[PDB]
């Protein structure tokens, strides 16, 4: 059984330190321990059964700190080495036992740098930089590759996509999305990379699309019920769930679950708190 954690975010002028846990078996969201820092634009993933919160922005400052949460003790610890620069609206994912931090902004520039965290050494190390600077990038891991999808180069949202080969330590550009998207959500579902929401040049998006590495093609997916920029996306007990965001008017606590058989997204009441640009992580309990 898996549970999903929603971490941090932004609502109505403030960054958020609170954290909540969704239990699929009961469809209930419960508050757990808060982080030491308020963090919006926070990178979140799970490595060796610990939930990581990388960087973000606390409402006053861009952050380079990292903290991690043990569901067994319900404690956050600030015992993780910091990243080499601030990392806000950074994509974070796990590949080969390392936690990667991809893109973001440091407060002065949009980033193409990439570093990875070795939990055995408590150490971050720079690896190959991306071709493109990408704040608000989303990431996913499939077939031994780390994908960097969309983002903004500081001038415009991007439809471009690249993937990282850890054996070569090289990035390669692959097929682009049909829509430019920054602050989108990405996740692997049914061996394709799903990309949902974000903002294009003019609006928060409800649209979605998916990438098949066999064909190197993106294809449209049925749109979500709500437009959602700064949306989280994860698979929990085999179900693809979009979490929170901002629709153009309202900070969102609702969530949506994709039903591939019905080809529709189903909207649910969702979280205790509205969260734009939090992060999500999935723990196997």
């Amino acid at each position: 059984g898996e549970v999903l954690f929603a971490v941090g975010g932004w609502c109505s002028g403030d960054a958020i330190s609170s954290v909540e846990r969704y239990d699929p078996q009961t469809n209930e969201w419960r508050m757990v321990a808060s982080m030491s820092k308020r963090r919006c634009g926070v990178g979140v993933s799970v490595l060796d059964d610990l939930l990581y919160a990388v960087g973000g922005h606390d409402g006053s400052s861009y952050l380079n700190s990292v903290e991690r949460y043990d569901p067994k003790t319900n404690q956050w610890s600030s015992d993780v080495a910091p990243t080499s620069t601030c990392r806000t609206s950074v994509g974070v994912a796990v590949l080969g036992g390392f936690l990667y931090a991809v893109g973001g902004q440091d407060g002065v520039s949009c980033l193409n740098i990439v570093e990875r965290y070795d939990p055995k050494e408590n150490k971050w190390t720079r690896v190959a930089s991306m071709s493109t600077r990408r704040l608000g990038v989303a990431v996913a891991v499939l077939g031994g590759f780390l994908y960097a999808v969309g983002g903004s180069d500081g001038t415009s949202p991007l439809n471009t996509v690249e993937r990282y080969n850890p054996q070569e330590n090289r990035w390669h550009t692959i097929a682009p999305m049909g829509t430019r998207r920054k602050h989108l959500g990405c996740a692997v579902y049914q061996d394709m990379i799903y990309a949902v929401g974000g903002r294009d040049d003019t609006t928060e998006l409800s649209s979605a699309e998916r990438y098949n590495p066999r064909t190197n093609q993106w294809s449209p997916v049925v749109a979500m019920t709500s437009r959602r920029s700064g949306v989280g996306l994860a698979v929990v007990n085999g179900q693809l769930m979009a979490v929170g965001g901002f629709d153009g008017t309202t900070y969102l606590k609702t969530i949506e679950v994709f039903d591939p058989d019905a080809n529709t997204w189903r909207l649910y009441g969702g979280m205790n708190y509205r969260r734009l640009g939090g992060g999500v992580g999935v723990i196997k309990m």
Partner: peptide, 11 residues
Amino acid sequence: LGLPDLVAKYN
């Protein structure tokens, strides 16, 4: 400096 791109208003 500046508000993060994620959160600054568009209107």
